[PDB]
Design an enzyme around this catalytic site. Sequence first.
Site, PDB file in Angstrom:
ATOM      1  N   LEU A  62      57.602 -18.476 -17.024  1.00 34.23           N
ATOM      2  CA  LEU A  62      58.195 -17.968 -15.793  1.00 34.23           C
ATOM      3  C   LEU A  62      57.257 -18.225 -14.626  1.00 34.23           C
ATOM      4  O   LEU A  62      57.702 -18.564 -13.523  1.00 34.23           O
ATOM      5  CB  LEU A  62      58.501 -16.479 -15.939  1.00 34.23           C
ATOM      6  CG  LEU A  62      59.558 -16.180 -17.010  1.00 34.23           C
ATOM      7  CD1 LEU A  62      59.487 -14.732 -17.478  1.00 34.23           C
ATOM      8  CD2 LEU A  62      60.955 -16.506 -16.492  1.00 34.23           C
ATOM      9  N   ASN A  94      53.854  -7.981  -6.489  1.00 35.96           N
ATOM     10  CA  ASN A  94      53.703  -7.056  -7.617  1.00 35.96           C
ATOM     11  C   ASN A  94      54.916  -6.125  -7.852  1.00 35.96           C
ATOM     12  O   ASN A  94      54.804  -5.142  -8.592  1.00 35.96           O
ATOM     13  CB  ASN A  94      52.413  -6.241  -7.411  1.00 35.96           C
ATOM     14  CG  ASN A  94      51.165  -7.127  -7.339  1.00 35.96           C
ATOM     15  OD1 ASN A  94      51.010  -8.047  -8.128  1.00 35.96           O
ATOM     16  ND2 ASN A  94      50.294  -6.868  -6.381  1.00 35.96           N
ATOM     17  N   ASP A 100      52.469  -5.023 -12.441  1.00 27.42           N
ATOM     18  CA  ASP A 100      51.067  -5.430 -12.246  1.00 27.42           C
ATOM     19  C   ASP A 100      50.139  -4.207 -12.161  1.00 27.42           C
ATOM     20  O   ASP A 100      49.556  -3.894 -11.119  1.00 27.42           O
ATOM     21  CB  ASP A 100      50.923  -6.386 -11.046  1.00 27.42           C
ATOM     22  CG  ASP A 100      51.540  -7.770 -11.317  1.00 27.42           C
ATOM     23  OD1 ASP A 100      52.694  -7.844 -11.804  1.00 27.42           O
ATOM     24  OD2 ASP A 100      50.869  -8.789 -11.038  1.00 27.42           O
TER      25      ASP A 100
HETATM   26  C1  LIG Z   1      54.526 -12.813  -9.871  1.00 28.50           C
HETATM   27  O1  LIG Z   1      54.890 -13.247 -11.192  1.00 28.50           O
HETATM   28  C2  LIG Z   1      55.062 -14.639 -11.506  1.00 28.50           C
HETATM   29  C3  LIG Z   1      53.789 -15.459 -11.377  1.00 28.50           C
HETATM   30  O2  LIG Z   1      53.841 -16.654 -11.154  1.00 28.50           O
HETATM   31  N1  LIG Z   1      52.594 -14.842 -11.557  1.00 28.50           N
HETATM   32  C4  LIG Z   1      51.292 -15.546 -11.500  1.00 28.50           C
HETATM   33  C5  LIG Z   1      50.822 -15.535 -10.034  1.00 28.50           C
HETATM   34  C6  LIG Z   1      50.418 -14.909 -12.591  1.00 28.50           C
HETATM   35  C7  LIG Z   1      49.099 -14.435 -12.422  1.00 28.50           C
HETATM   36  C8  LIG Z   1      48.423 -13.859 -13.503  1.00 28.50           C
HETATM   37  C9  LIG Z   1      49.058 -13.757 -14.753  1.00 28.50           C
HETATM   38  N2  LIG Z   1      48.409 -13.172 -15.858  1.00 28.50           N
HETATM   39  C10 LIG Z   1      48.980 -12.813 -17.047  1.00 28.50           C
HETATM   40  C11 LIG Z   1      48.013 -12.275 -17.824  1.00 28.50           C
HETATM   41  F1  LIG Z   1      48.158 -11.802 -19.077  1.00 28.50           F
HETATM   42  C12 LIG Z   1      46.821 -12.297 -17.102  1.00 28.50           C
HETATM   43  N3  LIG Z   1      47.050 -12.826 -15.934  1.00 28.50           N
HETATM   44  N4  LIG Z   1      50.308 -14.207 -14.877  1.00 28.50           N
HETATM   45  C13 LIG Z   1      50.975 -14.765 -13.875  1.00 28.50           C
HETATM   46  C14 LIG Z   1      56.254 -15.258 -10.721  1.00 28.50           C
HETATM   47  C15 LIG Z   1      57.592 -14.607 -11.102  1.00 28.50           C
HETATM   48  C16 LIG Z   1      57.824 -14.832 -12.599  1.00 28.50           C
HETATM   49  C17 LIG Z   1      59.216 -14.402 -12.978  1.00 28.50           C
HETATM   50  N5  LIG Z   1      60.245 -15.154 -12.593  1.00 28.50           N
HETATM   51  C18 LIG Z   1      61.501 -14.817 -12.924  1.00 28.50           C
HETATM   52  C19 LIG Z   1      62.657 -15.669 -12.462  1.00 28.50           C
HETATM   53  C20 LIG Z   1      61.724 -13.661 -13.684  1.00 28.50           C
HETATM   54  C21 LIG Z   1      60.609 -12.885 -14.089  1.00 28.50           C
HETATM   55  N6  LIG Z   1      60.795 -11.725 -14.847  1.00 28.50           N
HETATM   56  C22 LIG Z   1      59.802 -10.837 -15.342  1.00 28.50           C
HETATM   57  C23 LIG Z   1      58.390 -10.812 -15.230  1.00 28.50           C
HETATM   58  C24 LIG Z   1      57.929  -9.731 -15.897  1.00 28.50           C
HETATM   59  C25 LIG Z   1      56.493  -9.303 -16.045  1.00 28.50           C
HETATM   60  N7  LIG Z   1      58.987  -9.077 -16.401  1.00 28.50           N
HETATM   61  N8  LIG Z   1      60.135  -9.782 -16.047  1.00 28.50           N
HETATM   62  N9  LIG Z   1      59.400 -13.308 -13.709  1.00 28.50           N
HETATM   63  C26 LIG Z   1      56.721 -14.068 -13.364  1.00 28.50           C
HETATM   64  C27 LIG Z   1      55.351 -14.658 -13.014  1.00 28.50           C
END
Ligand SMILES: CO[C@]1(C(=O)N[C@@H](C)c2ccc(-n3cc(F)cn3)nc2)CC[C@H](c2nc(C)cc(Nc3cc(C)[nH]n3)n2)CC1
Lengths: 285, 273
Positions: free
Chosen positions: B27, B150, B163
């Site tokens: 994602l 977040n 988060d």
């Molecule tokens: C803000 O979150 C996103 C992202 O790109 N995050 C980055 C910046 C990021 C940084 C650090 C780590 N870490 C993960 C770890 F375990 C440690 N660090 N993971 C991701 C962008 C949105 C994305 C998402 N997109 C869609 C269409 C749906 C969706 N659904 C969700 C997501 C959840 C948690 N439940 N349901 N999530 C989830 C990841």
Amino acid sequence: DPKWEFPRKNLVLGKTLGEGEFGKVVKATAFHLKGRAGYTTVAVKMLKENASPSELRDLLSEFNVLKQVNHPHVIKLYGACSQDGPLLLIVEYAKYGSLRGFLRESRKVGPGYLGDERALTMGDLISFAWQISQGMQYLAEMKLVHRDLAARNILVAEGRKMKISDFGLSRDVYEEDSYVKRSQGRIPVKWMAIESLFDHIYTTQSDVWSFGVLLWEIVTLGGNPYPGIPPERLFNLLKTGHRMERPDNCSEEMYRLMLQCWKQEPDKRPVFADISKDLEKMMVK
Amino acid sequence: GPLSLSVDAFKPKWEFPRKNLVLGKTLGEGEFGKVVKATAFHLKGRAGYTTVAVKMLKENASPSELRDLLSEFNVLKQVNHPHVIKLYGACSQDGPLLLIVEYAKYGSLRGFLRESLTMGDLISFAWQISQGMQYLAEMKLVHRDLAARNILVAEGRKMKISDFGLSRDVQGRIPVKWMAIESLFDHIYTTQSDVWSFGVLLWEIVTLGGNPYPGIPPERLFNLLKTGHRMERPDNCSEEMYRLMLQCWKQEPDKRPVFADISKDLEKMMVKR
Ligand SMILES: CO[C@]1(C(=O)N[C@@H](C)c2ccc(-n3cc(F)cn3)nc2)CC[C@H](c2nc(C)cc(Nc3cc(C)[nH]n3)n2)CC1
Ligand SMILES: CO[C@]1(C(=O)N[C@@H](C)c2ccc(-n3cc(F)cn3)nc2)CC[C@H](c2nc(C)cc(Nc3cc(C)[nH]n3)n2)CC1
């Protein structure tokens, strides 16, 4: 500081060379930089708009450290733009990028690893390690633990010259020959010494551990350490006695040096001046 | 140390069997970790497959990252609210540490808004978050990293606070542009510094995922906030809403509204439409 402050109008920023979550390194050019006539190609380290206080403190600390250290294999600071704008840190342009990136390219790019500028031998790999070891020798003499020593944080300059970079996590250790933080560190777990991971103790001897991990990265041409093993598993793996196995494309002599760097007891590990001598004795043979 | 003890302790109610988790597409991802969509068979006595989100570390993860992930797990076991992201469990016995959480289909709130909704929808979002924060504040939990990145947007456009890796009950890695002034100058984090951050989140909602303090670098914000300056009233924002932002950004934490007052203000806006 008037010795380091550079007129902002004289700096012109170009493309992004690479990027983190909180900051970036852009290729740039600087006009009338420290006596030079005309323009000079430079790298500019700077923060993104989402920057935390820790990222700002680290960039400020990188600047502080770089004012005080001059060595042929440490990245050269030219100055900073730090008034009427964001803090822009102006450093020497290393043309081949990171050591990791350089070495990973030599797998793909001919003539490649062979056992001029793209042809690599085992002789050249030992030379790279020796250059970095000479820089760490000097940094340890300055009472300065780098902490984040890794192939992603070494840069490769004109004439394949190693430049230790990414000083944001480095600390002064004149107090007790050690840096101790109560809270959890931001060094990747796979480059940390056992006493840094368990006990939060950072010394020159934990930089020796990290250098041992860098040696392994060098000989595997930018390999990923502890391949396939989750970082939470390193606690138990290191405590029980396990270390990375001898990589294919590595001598007994070189692997003994790695295993020396990864001794549990930090007094039983070699100092950087001994490491330089070992690599010299490897080179000549 | 603290982390080696936690990691060892961490290795029934929350242990999900690994064989029942099928990891799907990524994602999104940062430098040191990622979030992947997955299907979970017999998740918490539920029939068939439940879609979930899985947080895992990448292999250059620091101790800081690993602590944050375990800290999130620790916090999310203690909380249950429709506007806080639900924990289902963790895989701790079979390869890497997987944290299994609620799946919200539309991603982050920031990303949802940047795609774009009426002013009534935007006020409804701020109210939901404020409700979940009123619950967290009641549970003695300071969130610390309140921001549109977040917050997650679930089915039916329901806001989920997420988060929780930096949350603490009762140096700094929260971005400067969301932090309260006492957090910036004294490193103090309370419910009243979450209020400040909510005010910035409220600004993000009305601007449809704007970048706060646009063209001011984070390094210069310290002295702009200290002297008295704040963000001006953005376009497509009422007098009533801007007044509520300005009060969240009062210097003295006692003069800021509590989350019940915020919710009450937002309840009073929606009934007058
Ligand atoms: C803000 O979150 C996103 C992202 O790109 N995050 C980055 C910046 C990021 C940084 C650090 C780590 N870490 C993960 C770890 F375990 C440690 N660090 N993971 C991701 C962008 C949105 C994305 C998402 N997109 C869609 C269409 C749906 C969706 N659904 C969700 C997501 C959840 C948690 N439940 N349901 N999530 C989830 C990841
Ligand atoms: C390993 O470094 C790179 C990278 O992707 N870094 C990421 C991970 C990164 C993370 C945080 C921040 N921060 C910057 C801040 F101010 C705070 N954090 N910047 C960048 C990849 C290599 C890139 C580079 N490529 C080439 C071909 C040449 C080159 N030359 C240089 C580079 C320098 C400093 N001098 N000369 N650099 C530099 C950036």
